[PDB]
Amino acid sequence: VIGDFNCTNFAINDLNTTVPRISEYVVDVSYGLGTYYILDRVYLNTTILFTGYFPKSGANFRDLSLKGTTYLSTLWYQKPFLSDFNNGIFSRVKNTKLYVNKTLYSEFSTIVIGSVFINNSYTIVVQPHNGVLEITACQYTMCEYPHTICKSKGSSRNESWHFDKSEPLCLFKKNFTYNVSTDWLYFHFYQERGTFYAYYADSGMPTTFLFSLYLGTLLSHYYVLPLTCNAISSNTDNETLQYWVTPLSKRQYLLKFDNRGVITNAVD
Ligand SMILES: *[C@@H]1O[C@H](CO)[C@@H](O[C@@H]2O[C@H](CO)[C@@H](O[C@@H]3O[C@H](CO[C@H]4O[C@H](CO)[C@@H](O)[C@H](O)[C@@H]4O)[C@@H](O)[C@H](O[C@H]4O[C@H](CO)[C@@H](O)[C@H](O)[C@@H]4O)[C@@H]3O)[C@H](O)[C@H]2NC(C)=O)[C@H](O)[C@H]1NC(C)=O
Numbered sequence: 001v002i003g004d005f006n007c008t009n010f011a012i013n014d015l016n017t018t019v020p021r022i023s024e025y026v027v028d029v030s031y032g033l034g035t036y037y038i039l040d041r042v043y044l045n046t047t048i049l050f051t052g053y054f055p056k057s058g059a060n061f062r063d064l065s066l067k068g069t070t071y072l073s074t075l076w077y078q079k080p081f082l083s084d085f086n087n088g089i090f091s092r093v094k095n096t097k098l099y100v101n102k103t104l105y106s107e108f109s110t111i112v113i114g115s116v117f118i119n120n121s122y123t124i125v126v127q128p129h130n131g132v133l134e135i136t137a138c139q140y141t142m143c144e145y146p147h148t149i150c151k152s153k154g155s156s157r158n159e160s161w162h163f164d165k166s167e168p169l170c171l172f173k174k175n176f177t178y179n180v181s182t183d184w185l186y187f188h189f190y191q192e193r194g195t196f197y198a199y200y201a202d203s204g205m206p207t208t209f210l211f212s213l214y215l216g217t218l219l220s221h222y223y224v225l226p227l228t229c230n231a232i233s234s235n236t237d238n239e240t241l242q243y244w245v246t247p248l249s250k251r252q253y254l255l256k257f258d259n260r261g262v263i264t265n266a267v268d
């Protein structure tokens, strides 16, 4: 389970759907994937050695996205999907572009980052709403079996990842826009000295700082929420979710900046 609040028992089973395991892909930073822009500094036409929170090059990404239709598996809410956060994670996220009457809609998996996921602790939640990235850090009463829905194509079940009938205490609540037309989003989520840090990019690969948040406590787990949809499958549209994650660690990188200050290349 993620939280311990019984939000529902509608269409839950124990099936091991990942007979083909958690999908894998290899980290390659040679074109600036896994890197970020440094503070308020601009470097031009140069190579820098910098120590930052970065992927290990040649490590695996795990695809933790979980598309459902009606049923949820209890095994989706356990290890290996419920994951240790440690120093942080780098995410490579597919923007699943769906269409209704030729209007484009953007979907991708929510990530929750926390410790015990109980309403006596703060859970950071990062959720897309078709070009708005809603980010909150609140004392959420997380469900046992949290998930999101396609609001675009609909779903055979209602959205429930928390059950707070009155608004919970929040340390953070902001909306960041993102370009609904891009194929990929990139995120760094990391912690240092009881402060959480987020970086993202919706365009290019090197991420830029979104926000930081003092928590005063260690984050220990993260979980990519299942998304339930009547679309996003081979029998209906051949679309897919992908939410690739890999661990961060404190690493020295070479970073190369072009004559317009973009990180074009890196070495671990
Ligand atoms: C912070 O988060 C915690 C969870 O970590 C929340 O605590 C839980 O809150 C719920 C709701 O109050 C507790 O609900 C339990 O419901 C059982 C019956 O459920 C069915 O029936 C009701 C209608 O009667 C429906 O609403 C419901 O949907 C179900 O269909 C009761 O049997 C439970 O009773 C407990 O206490 C009695 C003694 O008083 C014992 O006899 C029982 O055996 C049982 O132990 C209870 O009412 C749930 O138990 C809570 N869990 C914990 C760990 O406390 C907090 O509500 C939340 N706080 C805030 C501010 O959001």
Ligand SMILES: CC(=O)N[C@H]1[C@H]([C@H](O)[C@H](O)COC(C)=O)O[C@@](O[C@H](CO)[C@@H](O)[C@@H]2O[C@@](O)(C(=O)O)C[C@H](O)[C@H]2NC(C)=O)(C(=O)O)C[C@@H]1O
Residues within 6 Å of the ligand: 013, 015, 017, 018, 065, 066, 067, 068, 069, 070, 071, 072, 073, 229, 230, 231, 232, 233, 234, 235, 236
């Ligand atoms: C994490 C994972 O494994 N994700 C896959 C999912 C699950 O394995 C399955 O949900 C688990 O189920 C449990 C826990 O019991 O299966 C999907 O594929 C299905 C066939 O496997 C799909 O074709 C569905 O087939 C139906 O027969 C049915 O109900 O499953 C009719 C339904 O209308 C149709 N869905 C549509 C139209 O999207 C899906 O989507 O659900 C593709 C997802 O990538």
Ligand SMILES: *[C@@H]1O[C@H](CO)[C@@H](O[C@@H]2O[C@H](CO)[C@@H](O[C@@H]3O[C@H](CO)[C@@H](O)[C@H](O)[C@@H]3O)[C@H](O)[C@H]2NC(C)=O)[C@H](O)[C@H]1NC(C)=O
Residues within 6 Å of the ligand: 129, 132, 134, 173, 174, 175
């Ligand atoms: C950040 O972005 C999210 C997503 O767009 C915003 O949440 C949405 O805010 C609107 C306006 O408050 C909500 O609509 C209202 O909902 C109530 C309850 O159903 C209804 O009575 C009102 O008439 C109105 O429809 C909407 O429900 C809410 N959630 C979603 C998923 O859309 C949020 O307000 C933005 N701002 C901040 C500071 O977070």
Ligand SMILES: *[C@@H]1O[C@H](CO)[C@@H](O[C@@H]2O[C@H](CO)[C@@H](O)[C@H](O)[C@H]2NC(C)=O)[C@H](O)[C@H]1NC(C)=O
Residues within 6 Å of the ligand: 006, 007, 008, 009
């Ligand atoms: C979780 O909550 C659900 C309700 O959302 C509980 O399901 C009900 O259980 C009682 C047991 O007497 C039945 O009479 C009802 O028919 C059930 N369904 C509904 C819709 O109320 C469920 O028991 C709870 N606990 C667990 C472990 O799932």
Ligand SMILES: *[C@@H]1O[C@H](CO)[C@@H](O[C@@H]2O[C@H](CO)[C@@H](O)[C@H](O)[C@H]2NC(C)=O)[C@H](O)[C@H]1NC(C)=O
Residues within 6 Å of the ligand: 045, 259
């Ligand atoms: C970016 O920096 C490089 C390295 O200093 C510059 O490349 C040199 O350019 C001169 C002509 O201006 C050539 O004679 C050298 O042979 C080049 N060296 C290399 C290693 O290519 C480059 O001009 C700079 N560009 C900008 C726009 O600043």
Ligand SMILES: *[C@@H]1O[C@H](CO)[C@@H](O[C@@H]2O[C@H](CO)[C@@H](O)[C@H](O)[C@H]2NC(C)=O)[C@H](O)[C@H]1NC(C)=O
Residues within 6 Å of the ligand: 179, 180, 181, 182, 183, 203
């Ligand atoms: C939103 O994202 C799309 C897709 O990456 C951007 O479209 C590209 O725009 C450049 C010019 O800026 C063109 O050279 C490319 O050919 C476009 N690609 C496609 C697939 O159309 C778009 O510019 C972005 N818009 C904003 C405001 O960020």
Ligand SMILES: *[C@@H]1O[C@H](CO)[C@@H](O)[C@H](O)[C@H]1NC(C)=O
Residues within 6 Å of the ligand: 016, 018, 019, 020, 021, 075
């Ligand atoms: C699910 O099935 C695969 C293939 O047999 C296996 O490797 C994996 O350990 C199973 N997972 C669980 C939770 O049993």
Ligand SMILES: *[C@@H]1O[C@H](CO)[C@@H](O)[C@H](O)[C@H]1NC(C)=O
Residues within 6 Å of the ligand: 010, 156, 157, 158
């Ligand atoms: C979804 O919510 C509506 C409104 O409360 C309800 O009528 C419907 O039965 C719910 N369906 C499920 C599967 O929870």
Ligand SMILES: *[C@@H]1O[C@H](CO)[C@@H](O)[C@H](O)[C@H]1NC(C)=O
Residues within 6 Å of the ligand: 234, 235, 236, 237, 238
């Ligand atoms: C999905 O792709 C496969 C392979 O190209 C094809 O056989 C199938 O008809 C496609 N289905 C849909 C709904 O596009």
